[PDB]
Amino acid sequence: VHFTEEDKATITSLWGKVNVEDAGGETLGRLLVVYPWTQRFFDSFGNLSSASAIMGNPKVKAHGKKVLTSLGDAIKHLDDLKGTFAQLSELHCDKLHVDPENFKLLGNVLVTVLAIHFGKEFTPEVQASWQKMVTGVASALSSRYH
Amino acid sequence: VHFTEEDKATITSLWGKVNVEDAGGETLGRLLVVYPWTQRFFDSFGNLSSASAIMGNPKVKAHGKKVLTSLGDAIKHLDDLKGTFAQLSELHCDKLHVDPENFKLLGNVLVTVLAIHFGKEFTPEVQASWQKMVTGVASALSSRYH
Amino acid sequence: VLSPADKTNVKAAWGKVGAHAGEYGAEALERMFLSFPTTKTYFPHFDLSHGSAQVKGHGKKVADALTNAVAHVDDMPNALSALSDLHAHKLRVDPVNFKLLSHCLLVTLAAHLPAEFTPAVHASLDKFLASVSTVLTSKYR
Amino acid sequence: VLSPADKTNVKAAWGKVGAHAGEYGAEALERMFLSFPTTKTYFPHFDLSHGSAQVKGHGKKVADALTNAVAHVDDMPNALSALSDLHAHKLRVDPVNFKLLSHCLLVTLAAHLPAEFTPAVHASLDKFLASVSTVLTSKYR
Ligand code: HEM
Ligand code: HEM
Numbered sequence: 001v002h003f004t005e006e007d008k009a010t011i012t013s014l015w016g017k018v019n020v021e022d023a024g025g026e027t028l029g030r031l032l033v034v035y036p037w038t039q040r041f042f043d044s045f046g047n048l049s050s051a052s053a054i055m056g057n058p059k060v061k062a063h064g065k066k067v068l069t070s071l072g073d074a075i076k077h078l079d080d081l082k083g084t085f086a087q088l089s090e091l092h093c094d095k096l097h098v099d100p101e102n103f104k105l106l107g108n109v110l111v112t113v114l115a116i117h118f119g120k121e122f123t124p125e126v127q128a129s130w131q132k133m134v135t136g137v138a139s140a141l142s143s144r145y146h
Numbered sequence: 147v148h149f150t151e152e153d154k155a156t157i158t159s160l161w162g163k164v165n166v167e168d169a170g171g172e173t174l175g176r177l178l179v180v181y182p183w184t185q186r187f188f189d190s191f192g193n194l195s196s197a198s199a200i201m202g203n204p205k206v207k208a209h210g211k212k213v214l215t216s217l218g219d220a221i222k223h224l225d226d227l228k229g230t231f232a233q234l235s236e237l238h239c240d241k242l243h244v245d246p247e248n249f250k251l252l253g254n255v256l257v258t259v260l261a262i263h264f265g266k267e268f269t270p271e272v273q274a275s276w277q278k279m280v281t282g283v284a285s286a287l288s289s290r291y292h
Numbered sequence: 293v294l295s296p297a298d299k300t301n302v303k304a305a306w307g308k309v310g311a312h313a314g315e316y317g318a319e320a321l322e323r324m325f326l327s328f329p330t331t332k333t334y335f336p337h338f339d340l341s342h343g344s345a346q347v348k349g350h351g352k353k354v355a356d357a358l359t360n361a362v363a364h365v366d367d368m369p370n371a372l373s374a375l376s377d378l379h380a381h382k383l384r385v386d387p388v389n390f391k392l393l394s395h396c397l398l399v400t401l402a403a404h405l406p407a408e409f410t411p412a413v414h415a416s417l418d419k420f421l422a423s424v425s426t427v428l429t430s431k432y433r
Numbered sequence: 434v435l436s437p438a439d440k441t442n443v444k445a446a447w448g449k450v451g452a453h454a455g456e457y458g459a460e461a462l463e464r465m466f467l468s469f470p471t472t473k474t475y476f477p478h479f480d481l482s483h484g485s486a487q488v489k490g491h492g493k494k495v496a497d498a499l500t501n502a503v504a505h506v507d508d509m510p511n512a513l514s515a516l517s518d519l520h521a522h523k524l525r526v527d528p529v530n531f532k533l534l535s536h537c538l539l540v541t542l543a544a545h546l547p548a549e550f551t552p553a554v555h556a557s558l559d560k561f562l563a564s565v566s567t568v569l570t571s572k573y574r
């Protein structure tokens with residue numbers, strides 16, 4: 001990864017302000033609602049048939065938290081995304097066979113959720129730093145494929 | 147990197163039998179014909195207004211040769227594509243702003259050109275080795291996008 | 293296909309843009325050019341600097357087109373027929389790049405209308421933009 | 434979608450395929466499973482070995498649907514209606530996978546009909562398969 005100095009500062013700063021308990025379930029729930037094929041990987045989670053069903057689903061909320069918690073941990077070492085996600089890559093690639101395009105989709109949904117929460121503070125420049133994070137996380141998670 | 151020895155054997159062998167000049171022009175020419183949005187990067191190449199003009203364009207042919215030569219040179223070091231294409235990554239990403247998804251398009255077009263030239267000898271197993279090459283090359287070129 | 297609720301949601305959300313449709317259009321383009329600089333290469337005759345008047349003017353055009361598409365949400369291909377010919381045949385835009393502008397539009401709407409941008413509305417808007425995109429690239433819903 | 438020249442090219446090329454449509458369908462699937470192994474998870478209890486009778490039978494289904502699409506090139510949303518419902522709602526096929534199968538179909542055609550696979554025909558066939566793919570992912574929109 002080639003995060004600029006500014007990118008790293010922007011990502012670290014904004015993350016410290018994030019309501020992870022809320023944005024986690026928001027992010028995964030929205031992914032499931034907006035891109036219904038992603039539900040294929042979450043059979044055991046129960047009723048995922050609509051926005052209402054998905055957004056009130058306890059398992060979705062709990063799992064979304066874990067996803068964003070993992071992102072927060074990666075943010076502690078932005079020069080080392082590949083290492084942070086190495087074991088997660090083996091899980092998502094070798095075991096679950098998720099197409100890499102979906103890592104980008106989840107990241108883009110997170111970006112929209114950050115925009116909801118931060119409003120005008122989520123400037124086009126701030127977004128561009130987060131889009132690099134999305135691409136970097138996706139690449140790190142895709143490492144086992146190729 | 148992800149290439150098995152068999153993959154390297156297959157890539158190296160088939161490449162030896164490729165006529166680089168002809169295949170280079172065919173690959174870049176088809177890229178421009180089949181995916182016309184890619185033409186916007188080649189305004190200085192002269193006439194690109196039709197299939198015949200594109201396929202008969204000398205600058206297109208010459209550039210295609212250059213492209214395939216860099217691929218052939220990379221084939222010598224399949225486990226270090228990232229390093230081999232570091233400079234080209236900077237050129238395409240930071241200077242030309244080529245869409246990273248278009249790297250895969252050129253590789254896939256090359257694969258179709260190999261299929262035309264080798265026919266039944268371009269087996270599904272042989273293609274699979276070559277698609278690893280496409281993915282590896284695209285990933286290496288896209289390095290400077292995150 | 294867009295559901296009755298999808299249509300209600302889309303009209304409601306885009307209505308909430310108020311006097312700022314053109315501004316939001318321009319913001320979406322600005323976001324797209326910054327995050328996805330490949331898209332700048334479709335605009336060689338534009339000043340693409342921050343706050344560019346040409347970008348502001350173009351954002352109003354994109355907004356107007358979306359406003360029309362929301363108005364004729366039941367017959368998208370007809371409302372966008374000219375723009376389809378333009379993007380698919382004159383400009384020859386990479387179909388995959390429509391996802392980029394769509395994403396930047398959603399981000400813009402989220403940044404301005406956080407109360408309105410529920411998961412359901414989000415889904416309705418994404419479906420709407422995805423269909424606008426396919427109509428523009430291929431005249432398919 | 435599909436110019437008159439595209440229609441002509443697709444009809445002529447897919448006409449050369451002929452008795453081998455099924456064989457080519459099976460080969461395209463085999464190519465996809467080998468090159469893009471993530472796609473195998475959609476076929477959990479298929480025999481996916483080389484020469485698989487199950488894959489051969491499925492190739493014929495995919496080939497026949499494409500043949501019907503060619504026959505109804507100006508009415509593809511209608512022609513592929515049941516298949517669009519199937520691939521989105523039941524199978525939940527990731528849209529990205531349609532590009533993968535389309536590529537493997539083009540490679541297959543190129544391997545078997547090199548002289549017919551001119552740049553112009555290549556372009557028309559790609560547009561046709563992209564149109565088929567757009568329709569097959571339409572129920573996500
Ligand atoms: C930025 C992108 C992503 C991140 C950071 C991420 C992170 C994680 C984490 C931390 C776990 C839990 C691992 C554990 O508990 O040990 C997990 C599990 C999982 N992920 Fe993701 N993930 C991402 C994208 C995706 C996508 C796009 C999908 C599907 C379309 C997906 C499907 C799954 C599934 C099915 C599980 C296991 C669920 C279960 O426990 O049954 N992930 N992921
Ligand atoms: C995917 C594998 C690709 C490879 C291996 C490759 C390789 C190369 C090479 C070797 C050069 C010459 C650089 C130099 O002489 O300094 C070059 C230049 C260039 N490439 Fe690529 N390229 C690829 C993809 C693409 C794609 C997909 C596009 C556009 C859609 C593109 C657009 C260009 C342009 C516009 C130039 C410079 C042309 C000029 O000199 O006017 N490349 N590339």
Ligand code: HEM
Nearest residue numbers: 331334335353354357358375379383385389390393424425
């Ligand atoms: C929701 C999707 C889109 C909408 C509603 C839209 C709408 C429009 C409109 C209304 C115009 C002005 C047409 C005119 O009166 O001349 C236009 C032009 C144009 N669009 Fe889009 N567009 C969309 C997607 C895109 C994308 C994704 C790109 C490229 C990444 C793009 C590139 C262009 C270009 C290059 C022009 C011509 C600008 C000029 O030369 O003046 N469009 N579009």
Ligand code: HEM
Nearest residue numbers: 472475476494495498499516520524526530531534565569
């Ligand atoms: C050119 C694009 C495609 C065409 C024309 C096509 C056509 C078909 C046809 C005709 C069937 C038989 C079902 C019926 O007639 O009721 C089928 C089933 C199926 N397709 Fe496709 N398909 C395409 C793309 C894909 C892709 C990209 C995938 C996944 C990567 C896929 C996965 C499946 C699966 C899992 C089945 C059911 C297999 C079973 O019986 O379990 N299809 N398709």
